[PDB]
Ligand binder design. Structure first.
Ligand SMILES: [Mg+2]
Lengths: 97, 95, 95, 95, 95
């Protein structure tokens, strides 16, 4: 899994039937020390991640193992909203509670 | 998934027998800002996307989960035609 | 999938029993609009693609969905020999 | 598989229900020489790796094949804590 | 599949139980002409390759389709020892 931040959304009305009601978030990947990277993913989200939240994203067939994900032609999903990130025992980031 | 633009097609008469009737689009992947990359994918299309339309592309086994996709040796598929893309707060794209 | 040209062959006499009868082609990926890159793949082929032909290559578990691919440890296969590629209006490639 | 070192942790309380109990480690990938890359992965750990230890990480569907991994939406997992790594007639690392 | 050269080994005693007896090789990916790249993989080896031998590596779920690979959380395996590699119209490698 990669760490990313939620930074937008995609909407579509013409799409595979199996994607009805699927929320598509745009994610910007986060690098060392939380660098905003010039790289992005569009991902399904069944967890309920808000704008600017740090998340874990899973890619490949992992995405189909989200809740009700089985028949969906998705290759990226949000799987967790990040509460904390630590490095070498120091908190680097933490979430509003 | 990645955001891409439909910019071509591919056709083939000598191919795996399971690929009959599968339509292939050439796609160009979006970079950052709203600028496109010189990086392309050929993808199955069952959604019916046309030139210049923006799409979501899924890669790997996800591609086998398009309509009638079971057991087809494909690793890339258009899964949606995009109407809007927002980023940070503003509207980066609108059909 | 990616577009590549067939450019060679690999052979092996010590290998997994699961690769019995598998022909290996070396493929060179097409890059920068229509120029060939210094990036290669080794791929299975049942369709009969020859030197210099253009092909669609599928990677990952898609490769095991070629005819007789089931349960072989292969992660790349030629799935189609390319007749035509069209970018926007014009062609670009035609066999 | 890739070689990485354990450099931190991630926690989460809003997540997929299938991920209850999953320990998430932050891993830094090994680059050239024994230099590490500014490139990180967050991986499940059933083996019980700690800070500064070297591990093998498997990605993709492999990760679901760790003990109890089945049907968890994870795409990276620690699968071994490394004792040694050699390159040629010598040792790059020993615990 | 990628062409790689065997350039070391990894050992581990604390590891997923399904990886008992698995031999791990460190491999370096081949690049431009004969040049080997500054990128590497660790791969399960059930075929028996030695130092400096050239090998085909299969990655992702292919790796679980080696003999008895089925429940192993591995994403890379040596599937063959290369005897020959031919590219365009010259021999690049011949053991
Ligand atoms: Mg032929």
């Amino acid at each position: 899994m990669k760490i990313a931040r939620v930074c937008g959304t995609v909407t579509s009305t013409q799409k595979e039937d199996t994607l009805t009601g699927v929320k598509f978030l745009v994610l910007q990947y986060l690098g060392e020390d939380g660098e905003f990277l010039p790289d992005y993913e569009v991902a399904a989200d069944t967890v309920g991640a808000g704008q600017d939240e740090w998340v874990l994203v899973s890619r490949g067939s992992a995405a189909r193992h989200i809740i009700n994900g089985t028949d969906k032609p998705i290759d990226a999903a949000v799987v967790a909203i990040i509460d904390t990130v630590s490095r070498d025992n120091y908190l680097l980031y933490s979430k509003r509670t």
